[PDB]
Design an enzyme around this catalytic site. Structure first.
Site: not given
Ligand SMILES: C#CCN(Cc1ccc2[nH]c(N)nc(=O)c2c1)c1ccc(C(=O)N[C@@H](CCC(=O)O)C(=O)O)cc1
Ligand SMILES: O=c1ccn(C2C[C@H](O)[C@@H](COP(=O)(O)O)O2)c(=O)[nH]1
Ligand SMILES: C#CCN(Cc1ccc2[nH]c(N)nc(=O)c2c1)c1ccc(C(=O)N[C@@H](CCC(=O)O)C(=O)O)cc1
Ligand SMILES: O=c1ccn(C2C[C@H](O)[C@@H](COP(=O)(O)O)O2)c(=O)[nH]1
Lengths: 316, 316
Positions: B60, B82, B146, B198, B218, B221
Site C-alpha cells: 500500500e 482499499w 493519499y 486521516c 485527525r 482506531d
Molecule cells: C489500513 C488501511 C486503510 N483503510 C481504510 C479505512 C477507512 C475507514 C476507516 N474507518 C475507521 N473508523 N477505521 C479504519 O481503520 C478505517 C480504515 C483500511 C481498509 C480496510 C481495513 C481492513 O479491512 N483491514 C483491517 C483488519 C482487521 C481484521 O479484520 O481482522 C486492518 O487493520 O488492516 C483497514 C484499513
Molecule cells: O488507516 C486508518 C484509516 C482510518 N482511521 C479512522 C479513525 C476514525 O475512527 C475514522 C476516520 O475519522 P472519521 O471519518 O470517523 O471522522 O477512521 C484510522 O484510525 N486508520
C-alpha cells in the site's frame, strides 16, 4: 499554575535543544515535537511572568476573524504586528521613492542610523495606508494571511471556501466529528510565500460541553512567538465556543520545531527566576453573538497582574 | 521496549476515554490530543504483541509513493485495504447489475448471508479491475487518496503539485526548514469526500543526520488503525531518509481523536496481558535509490517475532 507548560518548555529547550542554524544564521536550540495543554475553565494563559499585551493580540485576531487582509484595520487599532511585510511589497514596486530601504529592519536592531530613515519611510507609508484609499488598496493588502486563509480559501473553480465559517456551523450541527479542521497550508502557494502560516492547522473537538482545540504549529520562537500564540488560540477558542453555545475545556498546542533563539538565552533565564501569579480572566460579552461581529470592547480581560516585561532582539 | 507508547495509549484510553457516539453509533472512548515517539535507530514499531502484516502495509505504501490511485496495483499484491470504496463507486453507477448491494459490509460482520452475495459481487469486480482495462479505468480509480494527494496536488490553474517530491529535494538542498510539510487536507474537497485523509499532515525535520517525522492525524482506531499507521509512517521515514542520504532518528505521532472502539474493549485487554518481545529490524536495499522505484523485495523486514493475532469487529 496554568502557564507552567511554557516554562517546562522554555527550560527544556535551553536545556536539551540542539544548535540549528535557522533561515538567517541565528542560533536556535530546538526540540522537534512537543504538545502542551491549558484548562481554560481554570483561567487565561497570559503569562503573568512577562507582561504580554492583550489589546494587541485581540485586535489582530478579530481582523483575522473578519477575513480582512488589509493592513489598514490594524493601523486603526494601533497594532503593528504586520507592517514590515507590506513595506517590502511597497519598497519593491515601481512606486517606492527616495531611500536605501534595501534591508530596513535587518539593520534596525543593530545598523546604521536606520530607525530615522526606515522608521520615517515606514510611518509615511503606514500613514498613507490609513488615509489613501487606492493606496490601502494597493500595498496595504498583504493577500494570503490567515484571514484570507481561514475565511475565503481559494478554489480551483475560481471561488472562495469560508472554511472556518463552515466549521463553526459544523459544531452546532453535530458535536462529534473528527473533521472540525481549518487548514491554512495550501501547497500551491508556498513557492511564492512571504511567511508561510506558522500555525499550520488546527482542530476542534466537542466533548460534552467543553470545546477544546489542537493547533499544529510548524515552528515556534519560544521567547516572543509562543507567549502571543498561546493566547491567540485561547481567545479564538473562547470566542468559537461562545458562538456555538458551548463551554470551554482545554487548549492543546503541538509544535513541530519549537526553538529558542540563541539571542534570547539570557532573557528566558530572566523569566525563569520568576514565580507565577494567578491566571487572568476574560469577559465575553453576553448579549453579542455572531463572533465575526465581535468588536474589541466585547472581549474585556479581567485581573491581569503581570510581572514587568523582558527586552528581546527581533527574530530577524 | 519501542512499542510501549501504544500500550500506554491503549491503556490510557480504556482508562480515561469518554464515551462518544461516532459517525455510526458505535461507542468510542476518546482522548483528544496525544503525542507518541519511537527511536527507529533502536528498531521497528511493529507490535510484537499482536501480529501485524508487513507485506500488506508496504505494498500500500509504495502504491502511495507511486502517485497511483487505481485500486489495481493492490490487487496484483493481494492487498485489499482499499476495495469497499471502489465498490460503492461501482454499485452506485448506472452499470451495477444484479443484487441488493444496498449496504454490503455494513451487514457482513453481522448480517444476512451477505458474505456469499457481497463477497461474490466483490470478488467479481475485484477480478474485473485486475483484467478489464476500461473497467480499471472506470471504477477502480478511487481519485483522491493519499497518492494523488501527496504526489500530484490539484492546482487552481489546472496542473499538479508533486508536493512530496519537492519536499525530499528540499531535504538534500538544505537540512534545516520548518517547511518540510506534505499536507493532504484540501479544504475544497471535503464536501465530496469518501474518507477524508486521516493522517492529515506531516512534517520532517533533519537534525544532524537523523531525520524524524511528525504526523498529525485527525482520528485513530486504537485497535486496528493505529498498529498499521505507526508502521506505515515509520517505513516512509526509513525510505525518505535513505533517499536524501540521512540516517534515522525518531518518529513522532500526534492524534486529534485517538479512540478505541467500544466493540474492541475486550480485545485490547487481551493484548495488555502480553509482554513485549524485542523490536524487528528492516533491510533497505542498498544499491537502490530513487525511492519512488522501490519495489517490494527492496524492503525485506528481519526478525519479526510476534505474538499470535486478535480478532476485531470491523470499524464499520
Ligand atoms: C489500513 C488501511 C486503510 N483503510 C481504510 C479505512 C477507512 C475507514 C476507516 N474507518 C475507521 N473508523 N477505521 C479504519 O481503520 C478505517 C480504515 C483500511 C481498509 C480496510 C481495513 C481492513 O479491512 N483491514 C483491517 C483488519 C482487521 C481484521 O479484520 O481482522 C486492518 O487493520 O488492516 C483497514 C484499513
Ligand atoms: O488507516 C486508518 C484509516 C482510518 N482511521 C479512522 C479513525 C476514525 O475512527 C475514522 C476516520 O475519522 P472519521 O471519518 O470517523 O471522522 O477512521 C484510522 O484510525 N486508520
Ligand atoms: C505576533 C505576530 C505576527 N507577526 C509576524 C511574524 C513573522 C515572522 C516571524 N519570524 C520569527 N522567527 N518569529 C516571529 O515571531 C515572527 C513573526 C509578528 C510581527 C511582528 C512582531 C513584533 O514586532 N512584535 C514582538 C515584540 C517583542 C519586542 O520587540 O520587544 C511580539 O512578540 O509581538 C511579532 C510577531
Ligand atoms: O507569531 C508567530 C510568527 C512566526 N513564528 C516563527 C517561528 C519560526 O522561527 C519562523 C517561521 O518558520 P520559518 O519561516 O523560519 O521556517 O517564525 C512564531 O513563532 N510566531
Amino acid at each position: 499554575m496554568l502557564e507552567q507548560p511554557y516554562l517546562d518548555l522554555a527550560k527544556k529547550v535551553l536545556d536539551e535543544g540542539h544548535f540549528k542554524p535557522d533561515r538567517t544564521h541565528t542560533g536556535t536550540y530546538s526540540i522537534f515535537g512537543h504538545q502542551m495543554r491549558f484548562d481554560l475553565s481554570k483561567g487565561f494563559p497570559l503569562l503573568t511572568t512577562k507582561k504580554v499585551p492583550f489589546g494587541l493580540i485581540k485586535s489582530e485576531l478579530l481582523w483575522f476573524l473578519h477575513g480582512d487582509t488589509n493592513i489598514r484595520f490594524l493601523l486603526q487599532h494601533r497594532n503593528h504586528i504586520w507592517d514590515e511585510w507590506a513595506f517590502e511589497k511597497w519598497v519593491k514596486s515601481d512606486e517606492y521613492h527616495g531611500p536605501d530601504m534595501t534591508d530596513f529592519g535587518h539593520r534596525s536592531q543593530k545598523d546604521p542610523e536606520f530607525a530615522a530613515v526606515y522608521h520615517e519611510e515606514m510611518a509615511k507609508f503606514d500613514d498613507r495606508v490609513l488615509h489613501d484609499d487606492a493606496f490601502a488598496a494597493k500595498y496595504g493588502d498583504l493577500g494570503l494571511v490567515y484571514g484570507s486563509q481561514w475565511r475565503a480559501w481559494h478554489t480551483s473553480k475560481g471561488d472562495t471556501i469560508d472554511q472556518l465559517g463552515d466549521v463553526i456551523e459544523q459544531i452546532k450541527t453535530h458535536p462529534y466529528s473528527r473533521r472540525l479542521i481549518v487548514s491554512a497550508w495550501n501547497p500551491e502557494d508556498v513557492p511564492t510565500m512571504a511567511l508561510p502560516p506558522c500555525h499550520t492547522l488546527y482542530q476542534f473537538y466537542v466533548n460534552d460541553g467543553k470545546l477544546s482545540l489542537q493547533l499544529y504549529q510548524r515552528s515556534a520562537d519560544i521567547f516572543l512567538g509562543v507567549p502571543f500564540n498561546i493566547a491567540s488560540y485561547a481567545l479564538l477558542t473562547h470566542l468559537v465556543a461562545h458562538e456555538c453555545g458551548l463551554e470551554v475545556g482545554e487548549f492543546i498546542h503541538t509544535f513541530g520545531d519549537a526553538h529558542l533563539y540563541v539571542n534570547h538565552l539570557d532573557q528566558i533565564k530572566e523569566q525563569l527566576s520568576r514565580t507565577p501569579r494567578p491566571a487572568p480572566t476574560l469577559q465575553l460579552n453576553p448579549d453579542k453573538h455572531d463572533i465575526f461581529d465581535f468588536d474589541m470592547k466585547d472581549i474585556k480581560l479581567l485581573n491581569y497582574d503581570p510581572y514587568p516585561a523582558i527586552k528581546a532582539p527581533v527574530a530577524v
